[PDB]
């Protein structure tokens, strides 16, 4: 058989079989109801547009994301994204078939046990298992040490690994990630005169992250340069029309990422938990986190993130050890990569979490010696 | 290498209709991966020789095998080969046969063409890990060879390109990954140039007879047993496995048929074990197929797997004695020749087949032969040369299935073309080596002496007789039970049937020891 | 036809058991009719599908699953077995479960017909100046609704008559002897309805037995 690499995701979700290069479905996890009436008879719409489906039709739809911060808030919401999942863009029924799901460090118990008792009841997985969403993007990254930065769109995690063994404690785990990037973008293009309020242009705005900002490598210097020059006033086609030139409000969203004192965050920037992440381990293994810092997650994309990370990084590491951060053009699907490597492994067969050994133990399952 | 299989088709009542091939397991890792005490196929070693300059001159080659890095990994030449007479082989060949005289140029393009692969350095960036070619001379010859452009080429093995949900997306590589990209297009396009070749040899012995029910007639490489027992010598090793599996439950059939026509656990399963430490899941092919797929995964840490999964879990798999100074030997099985080692360095190299997909597509853009021969998925960046064996052995096996066996073995009589100085050693070996002893040793297991009444009384009535000779006058299985009840045999030692009576192996000469003391 | 069938054998056998003083067999095949032939039924669905501005073949089974999934018996999701190339909804008929491929269906049901090209019709000088000599569907008069009408009309003349049915096989592709295929009695069994009138008799009591017939045989058992 082949099992299913799915990932939950925080604003696209991928799903494809294990043994591929990139997941074949890849698309938000929105649920829109309609807001208004439907004055036209007959026209047969349905109650739930999910997926990229309710990409197309944004104009008309309330968008939901049912993973807010890493978190299921919604379960009705994410049961419709599983089933839109498995049987539109995969076509495939999940009785024949295993599915690895990834879900973030730190998330709640009843998150991950919730999860489990979904797959078993409704979708009747035969064995499924629940995988940390860091760890795959050191399998896909073909690194045995090192800290992984899995920036995802929901949350930002630093998980700490040396020679294939993950550090509990040194573990750091940030809300401010894409999402919240997203509506400090809404909160600052408000600053120019262009007003976003409404969800559905969550996903205008999101598109400008895509693709206008970037992360500065200096941002006192790229303020004293955007307040006077305008060689980075560039411009935008939203979709009707009135094309808007983003100036200092570029490279000032992503750098929430490293100034968290922007949107009220108390905590220090990934730039310094990152830091902090490694000076939590031992005085020994630091030598190879140094080297073999990975960066993963759709947020790291920026362009240039990857020269401000390693500048801040050897501003705080001390200056005599070696800093290279390992970052492959793939970030966003690195997540999914190794976890096509994951379930792809023979010694990965005893690790499901079978039906039979589902049903002795309930759904607390999940924390036993099956992962 | 590989395997023949000459099907010379029939019509409906027995008419010699047709014939075609379809040749199996086309070595890829004898393409790129060369052992010093072997050497690759012939046709780059043709080219290398200086029998046609005009190849010379078009394949850019610098007359040398000790220079090219996937010949001189091996031997350039032994003893009793002469490379201008295989290209006098191959020019006779493609002089006449079905094709044309353009494809004769487009398979040396191709062969010249995998050969400026390997030369390329892919220096890493500094700082990065994408790795740049800089030395762009052998590339750009080859692609002047294949007919791809110079620099998508480079590109294309630097950056491929996949395809996630709707959107196209590159990934990076390291030095590594293109270094088994640039050994893995090439061995692939020379299987398929090869099965290709096979197809055109095809289309010439296809006559419009109307081809029914073939009497097809294999050919295959023999199992065979070295001091350097590798992954290539697994790849023929478990493929002769699975066809002396064939042979055990073949032989099974017809000894039940004989032994239920005559009233009186499988013996594939004395092979299976074998099989189930090589083909199912978590065995040594699996366990070397997803030992690539970790980050850091060195030769020395799938030993040390294949020790913490196998050692005592399977009576198969056990460790390895080394005699009289072989090199290095990692891990035995007691195959039906017996115990058998391995070494395993350097399989995780030649076990991959990463197909560099974006490469693939400038290979059908290029206006060459090769536009027509390269045009839930499954390993698009993870398939492997065990993955392929196994599916082609498969393949090779359900076609074996749907037909009936009818064996022949032959064997050589020493290194000499000569009279009778053979020796023993390696009849001893090939005796081994061919599954003749197994099929000794299976039939030993049930009654192999099959000898009719009559028979039994025309010969060994003399044995235990009564005081008449044998007249024919009681009837033979009641004249063989007369001899059986006063010859001091046990019950358990013979089993009485109806038209014959069969013997454990070992009792027809016991019919002759008291024999002899009757004719003293 | 079958509808017909059902019924009449119905009368006849009422009248038997009546002469004898011994649900309607129809009802048995009423319903897949209740799919087809009733308003909010499948050609009547097909039928305004194409009425609207942007309503394709994906939007029409969308639409055919939004309405009998569940609230008719006979509709149900089709079960696709050794390869067929594409099922979109199967009914179980009185052959049984029959799939049907949506794809192309709204552009075969319309029957527009241009009134003024069949003015010129009736203008030019041939045969079809004698051919073409509350309304209702000047633009928008489909097929299934011709269907519907040339249908009925057949069924009103079949109703006004008494029937004495016929049925006639092949027996397989070759004008041959007795090498029968039993794949292709067994299949036309089912599709010229040979095996629901065994089956509906069956229902009743088809053991007609006279009671003299009854004792010159089956005395013998007691
Ligand atoms: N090329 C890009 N440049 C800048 N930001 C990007 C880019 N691609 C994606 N993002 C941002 O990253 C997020 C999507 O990344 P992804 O890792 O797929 O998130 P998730 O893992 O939660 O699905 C979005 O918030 C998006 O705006
Ligand atoms: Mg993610």
């Known amino acids: ?29 929105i649920v829109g109801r309609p807001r208004h009436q439907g004055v036209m008879v007959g026209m047969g719409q349905k109650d739930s547009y999910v997926g990229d489906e309710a990409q197309s039709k944004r104009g008309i739809l309330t968008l939901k994301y049912p993973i807010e911060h890493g978190i299921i808030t919604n379960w009705d919401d ?12 995969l076509r495939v029924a999940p009785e024949e078939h295993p599915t690895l799901l990834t879900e973030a460090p730190l998330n709640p118990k009843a998150n991950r046990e919730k999860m489990t008792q979904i797959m078993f009841e409704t979708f009747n997985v035969p064995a499924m298992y629940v995988a940390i969403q860091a760890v795959l993007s050191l399998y896909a990254s073909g690194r045995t040490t090192g800290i992984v930065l899995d920036s995802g769109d929901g949350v930002t995690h630093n998980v700490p690994i040396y020679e294939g063994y993950a550090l509990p404690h040194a573990i750091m785990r940030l809300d401010l990630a894409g999402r919240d990037l997203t509506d400090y973008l809404m909160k600052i293009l408000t600053e120019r005169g262009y007003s976003f309020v409404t969800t559905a242009e969550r996903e205008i705005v999101r598109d400008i992250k895509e693709k206008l900002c970037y992360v500065a490598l200096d941002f006192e210097n790229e303020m004293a340069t955007a307040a006077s020059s305008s060689s980075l006033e560039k411009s935008y086609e939203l979709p009707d029309g009135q094309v808007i030139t983003i100036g200092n409000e570029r490279f000032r969203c992503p750098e929430t990422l490293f100034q968290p004192s922007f949107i009220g965050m108390e905590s220090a920037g990934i730039h310094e938990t990152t830091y902090n992440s490694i000076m939590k381990c ?42 290279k951060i390992i970052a492959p ?26 039906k039979q050994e589902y049903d002795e133990a309930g759904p607390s399952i999940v924390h036993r010696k099956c992962f | 290498r590989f395997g023949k299989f000459i099907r010379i088709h029939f019509g409906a009542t027995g008419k010699l209709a047709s014939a075609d091939i379809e040749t199996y397991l086309l070595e890829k890792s004898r393409v790129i991966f060369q052992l010093k005490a072997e050497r690759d196929y012939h046709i780059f070693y043709q080219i290398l020789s200086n029998k046609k300059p005009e190849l010379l001159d078009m394949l850019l080659i610098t007359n040398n095998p000790y220079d090219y890095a996937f010949i001189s990994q091996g031997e350039t030449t032994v003893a009793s080969i002469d490379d201008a007479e295989e290209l006098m082989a191959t020019d006779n060949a493609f002089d006449v046969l079905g094709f044309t005289s353009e494809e004769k ?26 790795a740049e070619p800089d030395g762009t001379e052998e590339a750009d010859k080859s692609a002047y060879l294949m007919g791809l452009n110079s620099a998508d080429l480079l590109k294309g093995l630097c950056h491929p390109r996949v395809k996630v949900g709707n959107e196209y997306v590159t990934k990076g590589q390291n030095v590594q990954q293109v270094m088994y990209a640039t050994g893995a297009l090439a061995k692939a396009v020379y299987e398929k140039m090869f099965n290709w070749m096979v197809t055109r040899i095809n ?26 027992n590798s992954f290539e010598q697994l790849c023929i090793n478990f493929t002769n496995e699975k066809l002396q599996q064939f042979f055990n439950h073949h032989m099974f059939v017809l000894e039940q048929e004989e032994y239920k026509k005559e009233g009186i656990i499988d013996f594939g399963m004395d092979l299976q074990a074998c099989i189930d430490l090589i083909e199912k899941p978590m065995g040594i092919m699996s366990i070397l197929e997803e030992e690539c797929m970790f980050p850091k995964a060195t030769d020395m840490t799938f030993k040390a797997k294949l020790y913490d999964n196998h050692l005592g879990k399977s009576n198969n798999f056990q460790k390895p004695r080394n005699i009289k100074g ?3 030997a990692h891990f035995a099985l007691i195959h039906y020749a017996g115990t058998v080692d391995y070494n395993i360095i350097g399989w995780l190299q030649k076990n991959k087949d990463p197909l560099n997909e974006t490469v693939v597509d400038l290979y059908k853009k290029s206006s060459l032969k090769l536009l027509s021969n390269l045009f839930a998925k499954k390993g698009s960046s993870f398939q492997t040369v065990s993955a392929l064996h196994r599916e082609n052995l498969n393949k090779l096996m359900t076609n074996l299935r749907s037909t009936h066996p009818h064996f022949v073995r032959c064997i050589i009589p020493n290194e000499t073309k000569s009279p009778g100085v053979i020796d023993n050693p390696l009849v001893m070996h090939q005796l081994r080596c061919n599954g003749v002893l197994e099929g000794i040793r299976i039939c030993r297991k049930g009654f192999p002496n099959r000898i009719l009444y009559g028979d039994f009384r025309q010969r060994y009535r003399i044995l235990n007789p009564a005081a008449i000779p044998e007249g024919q006058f009681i009837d033979s299985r009641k004249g063989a039970e007369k001899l059986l009840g006063s010859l001091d045999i046990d019950h358990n030692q013979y089993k009485f049937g109806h038209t014959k009576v069969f013997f454990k192996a070992g009792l027809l000469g016991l019919l002759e020891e008291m024999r002899d003391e009757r004719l003293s």
Request: net charge neutral; proline share 4%.
């Open chain 1, 329 to 354: 053009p793939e970030r966003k699907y690195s997540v999914w990569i190794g976890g096509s490597i994951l379930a792809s492994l023979s010694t990965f067969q005893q690790m499901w979490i079978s």
């Open chain 2, 326 to 328: 072989r090199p290095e």
């Open chain 1, 78 to 89: 994410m049961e419709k994204i599983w089933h839109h999942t498995f049987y539109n863009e």
């Open chain 1, 1 to 29: 058989t082949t099992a299913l690499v799915c990932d939950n995701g925080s604003g696209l979700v991928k799903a494809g079989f294990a043994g591929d290069d990139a997941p074949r479905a890849v698309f938000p996890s």
């Open chain 1, 282 to 323: 031992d005085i020994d293994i630091r030598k190879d986190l140094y080297a073999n810092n990975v960066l993963s997650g759709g947020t790291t994309m920026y362009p240039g993130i990857a020269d401000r990370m390693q500048k801040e990084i050897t501003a705080l590491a001390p200056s005599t050890m070696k800093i």
């Open chain 2, 105 to 130: 140029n487009s398979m040396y393009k191709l062969t010249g063409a995998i050969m400026h692969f390997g030369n390329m350095k892919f220096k890493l960036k500094q700082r990065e890990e994408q």
């Open chain 2, 203 to 228: 289309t010439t012995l296809e006559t419009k007879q109307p081809r029914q029910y073939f009497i097809g007639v294999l050919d295959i490489a023999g199992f065979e047993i070295f001091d350097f």
